[PDB]
Every structure is written in C-alpha cells, then in structure tokens.
Scaffold this active site. Structure first.
Site, PDB file in Angstrom:
ATOM      1  N   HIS A   1       0.841  -1.216   0.000  1.00 27.21           N
ATOM      2  CA  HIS A   1       0.000   0.000   0.000  1.00 27.21           C
ATOM      3  C   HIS A   1       0.870   1.258   0.000  1.00 27.21           C
ATOM      4  O   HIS A   1       0.325   2.349  -0.015  1.00 27.21           O
ATOM      5  CB  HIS A   1      -0.952  -0.066   1.227  1.00 27.21           C
ATOM      6  CG  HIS A   1      -0.433   0.249   2.622  1.00 27.21           C
ATOM      7  ND1 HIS A   1      -0.179  -0.555   3.587  1.00 27.21           N
ATOM      8  CD2 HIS A   1      -0.137   1.463   3.141  1.00 27.21           C
ATOM      9  CE1 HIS A   1       0.244   0.138   4.612  1.00 27.21           C
ATOM     10  NE2 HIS A   1       0.290   1.419   4.387  1.00 27.21           N
TER      11      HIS A   1
ATOM     12  N   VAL B   1      16.469  17.767   7.818  1.00 27.19           N
ATOM     13  CA  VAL B   1      17.834  18.394   7.791  1.00 27.19           C
ATOM     14  C   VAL B   1      18.914  17.536   7.174  1.00 27.19           C
ATOM     15  O   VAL B   1      18.866  16.365   7.501  1.00 27.19           O
ATOM     16  CB  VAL B   1      18.259  18.676   9.258  1.00 27.19           C
ATOM     17  CG1 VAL B   1      19.682  19.284   9.410  1.00 27.19           C
ATOM     18  CG2 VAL B   1      17.242  19.561   9.935  1.00 27.19           C
TER      19      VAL B   1
ATOM     20  N   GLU C   1      23.596  10.498   5.157  1.00 20.08           N
ATOM     21  CA  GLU C   1      22.464  10.187   4.254  1.00 20.08           C
ATOM     22  C   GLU C   1      22.836   9.745   2.836  1.00 20.08           C
ATOM     23  O   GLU C   1      23.832  10.172   2.257  1.00 20.08           O
ATOM     24  CB  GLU C   1      21.556  11.422   4.016  1.00 20.08           C
ATOM     25  CG  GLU C   1      20.865  11.856   5.257  1.00 20.08           C
ATOM     26  CD  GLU C   1      21.510  13.048   5.991  1.00 20.08           C
ATOM     27  OE1 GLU C   1      22.682  13.313   5.940  1.00 20.08           O
ATOM     28  OE2 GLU C   1      20.835  13.774   6.671  1.00 20.08           O
TER      29      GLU C   1
ATOM     30  N   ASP D   1       0.409  -7.745   1.829  1.00 19.86           N
ATOM     31  CA  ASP D   1       0.838  -6.323   1.753  1.00 19.86           C
ATOM     32  C   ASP D   1       2.369  -6.205   1.775  1.00 19.86           C
ATOM     33  O   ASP D   1       2.964  -5.803   2.749  1.00 19.86           O
ATOM     34  CB  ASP D   1       0.225  -5.584   2.931  1.00 19.86           C
ATOM     35  CG  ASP D   1       0.320  -4.061   2.729  1.00 19.86           C
ATOM     36  OD1 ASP D   1       0.671  -3.592   1.663  1.00 19.86           O
ATOM     37  OD2 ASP D   1       0.038  -3.307   3.641  1.00 19.86           O
TER      38      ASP D   1
ATOM     39  N   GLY E   1       2.345   6.964   8.683  1.00 11.21           N
ATOM     40  CA  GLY E   1       3.707   7.522   8.423  1.00 11.21           C
ATOM     41  C   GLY E   1       4.691   6.376   8.702  1.00 11.21           C
ATOM     42  O   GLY E   1       5.799   6.334   8.190  1.00 11.21           O
TER      43      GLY E   1
ATOM     44  N   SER F   1       3.877   3.106   8.125  1.00  9.39           N
ATOM     45  CA  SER F   1       3.577   2.056   7.098  1.00  9.39           C
ATOM     46  C   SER F   1       4.780   1.609   6.289  1.00  9.39           C
ATOM     47  O   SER F   1       5.554   2.453   5.922  1.00  9.39           O
ATOM     48  CB  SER F   1       2.541   2.586   6.126  1.00  9.39           C
ATOM     49  OG  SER F   1       1.366   2.817   6.910  1.00  9.39           O
TER      50      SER F   1
HETATM   51  N1  LIG Z   1      -2.452   1.247  14.387  1.00 12.55           N
HETATM   52  C1  LIG Z   1      -1.469   0.945  13.569  1.00 12.55           C
HETATM   53  N2  LIG Z   1      -0.541   0.094  13.925  1.00 12.55           N
HETATM   54  C2  LIG Z   1      -1.405   1.541  12.299  1.00 12.55           C
HETATM   55  C3  LIG Z   1      -0.317   1.322  11.422  1.00 12.55           C
HETATM   56  C4  LIG Z   1      -0.276   1.950  10.156  1.00 12.55           C
HETATM   57  C5  LIG Z   1      -1.320   2.775   9.819  1.00 12.55           C
HETATM   58  N3  LIG Z   1      -1.562   3.472   8.775  1.00 12.55           N
HETATM   59  C6  LIG Z   1      -2.701   4.073   8.984  1.00 12.55           C
HETATM   60  C7  LIG Z   1      -3.206   4.970   8.026  1.00 12.55           C
HETATM   61  N4  LIG Z   1      -2.621   4.971   6.830  1.00 12.55           N
HETATM   62  C8  LIG Z   1      -2.999   5.773   5.851  1.00 12.55           C
HETATM   63  C9  LIG Z   1      -4.050   6.668   6.033  1.00 12.55           C
HETATM   64  C10 LIG Z   1      -4.693   6.707   7.263  1.00 12.55           C
HETATM   65  C11 LIG Z   1      -4.286   5.858   8.287  1.00 12.55           C
HETATM   66  O1  LIG Z   1      -4.979   5.955   9.493  1.00 12.55           O
HETATM   67  N5  LIG Z   1      -3.266   3.797  10.149  1.00 12.55           N
HETATM   68  C12 LIG Z   1      -2.368   2.983  10.642  1.00 12.55           C
HETATM   69  C13 LIG Z   1      -2.443   2.384  11.881  1.00 12.55           C
HETATM   70 CA   LIG Z   2      18.437  14.230   7.613  1.00  8.48          CA
END
Ligand SMILES: NC(=[NH2+])c1ccc2[nH]c(-c3ncccc3[O-])nc2c1
Ligand SMILES: [Ca+2]
Length: 223
Positions: free
Chosen positions: A40, A57, A62, A84, A175, A177
């Site tokens: 995804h 920064v 890097e 996934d 973020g 993911s």
């Molecule tokens: N509870 C978790 N471990 C989790 C992990 C990844 C996620 N990614 C998302 C998410 N991704 C894209 C758009 C909205 C979301 O809430 N929720 C998430 C929740």
């Molecule tokens: Ca940096």
C-alpha cells in the site's frame, strides 16, 4: 509511533524513508540494492533515503537513491491488505557501513511473546497529527493469534500477525507504514494497518514476512 522513544541517530541502520517530496512510508534495507516495504506504499517517483535520522535536515550519513522498479506482490488485495509487501530495487547499490546496513530475513516465524523493535517517522499522537523530525522506536510483543482474531474478527489472514499493547498507548501509526518490526535480529513484520493508533484493544497488524521469504529470494534472483 505513539508511546515510543527517540531511537538515537543511526541506531536502526536498516530503516529507510520513502520520499516523493515528503516522507510518506518507511522500509527496510535487505541487501545493498533492495528494500522491502508495504504494497500500500506504492507510487511512482520514489526516492529512497538511507542513513536518516532527522528527515528535514541533511546532517551527514544520508544516501538518496532513486528506485529503479517497485514490485507489489501479485496477489496483494487493497481491500483486505492481504499480501501487503512490495520490493523496491534501487538505481545504484547503497554503500553499506555501520550507519546503513541490511537486516536479515527470518528462517522461522516468531512466536507470540517475542519482543520486537518497530521504528518510523509516523504520527506520535493517537488523536491528531504530530509527525516527528527524528526516528522513533517502540518495543512491542507479538500477540497470540486468538487475541489478534478476537480484536479484528474476520479481518486477519495467515499473512498477518498483531503486535502491540491491548491496553493502548503504544503502537505504530500512519507515516510508519512499510517499516520494520525486527525481533531477535530478523525482519519479522512490516507495518501494515490497525484501527486508529494506540486505541485500547485495537493492536497494530503487520505483514508476516516469514511467509514471503521464498518469494522475496526468487523475485530478487530473477530481477
Ligand atoms: N495502528 C497501527 N498500527 C497503524 C499502522 C499503520 C497505519 N496506517 C494508517 C493509516 N494509513 C494511511 C491513512 C490513514 C491511516 O490511518 N493507520 C495505521 C495504523
Ligand atoms: Ca536528515
């Protein structure tokens, strides 16, 4: 990461940031030219960023490399998020050192109770968005299959496992993911989904990497 701590610059040398003008997902370096992330997180125009700590920064260490191809699993289902996983080949190999290093694929699946490290630059609030500048870490255990299935009835396939805290407060979040779940030095999961972040009885769900090792080895071997 909600309820986590600051990892320390380059303490997680296999963590990568996927960037398309901003950070959108995490990933794991498994060899100098391949990264594993979540299907995804796919999009075109991805620059892989290695040796990162503060993503806003440039501080040294890097390496920014563009992705040559992204391979989403052929059976990935975007509605259930089953399968996934995605492999990204880099345009040139990364220079490995102690700050940029690959993580090993597992030889066996992990059992519930195993403690793992989850890291990422995703949201640190369960209600609202607060994205950090530096990398956050969280140590979480793999839960038993009955607690995972009782939490998400009918939504867990055998390619998913839950890790986290049912009491809430600590969890991965958006973020994060695509990023790693490492247990005993092996890449066992990929941050895939969950209901909200750090909510009670709603643990995080991860792709069970031990089920794709043959696919990963065969796909890298033929590309
Ligand atoms: N509870 C978790 N471990 C989790 C992990 C990844 C996620 N990614 C998302 C998410 N991704 C894209 C758009 C909205 C979301 O809430 N929720 C998430 C929740
Ligand atoms: Ca940096």
């Amino acid at each position: 990461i909600v309820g986590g701590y600051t990892c320390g610059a380059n303490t997680v040398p296999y963590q990568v940031s996927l960037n398309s003008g901003y950070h959108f997902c995490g990933g794991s370096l498994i060899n100098s030219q391949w990264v594993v992330s979540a299907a995804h997180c796919y999009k075109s125009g991805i620059q892989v960023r290695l040796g990162e700590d503060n993503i806003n920064v440039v501080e040294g260490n890097e390496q920014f490399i563009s992705a040559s191809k992204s391979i989403v699993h052929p059976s990935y289902n975007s509605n259930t998020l089953n399968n996934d996983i995605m492999l990204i080949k880099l345009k040139s190999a990364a220079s490995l050192n102690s700050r940029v290093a690959s993580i090993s694929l597992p030889t066996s699946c992990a059992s519930a109770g195993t403690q793992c490290l989850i890291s990422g630059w995703g949201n640190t609030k369960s209600s609202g968005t607060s994205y950090p500048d530096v990398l956050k870490c969280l140590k979480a255990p793999i839960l038993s299959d009955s607690s995972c299935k009782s939490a998400y009835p009918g939504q867990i396939t055998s390619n998913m496992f839950c890790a986290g805290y049912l009491e809430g407060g600590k969890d991965s979040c958006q973020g994060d993911s695509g990023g790693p779940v490492v247990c005993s030095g092996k890449l066992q999961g990929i941050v895939s989904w969950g209901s909200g972040c750090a909510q009670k009885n709603k643990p995080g769900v991860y792709t069970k990497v031990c089920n794709y090792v043959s696919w990963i080895k065969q796909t890298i071997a033929s590309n």
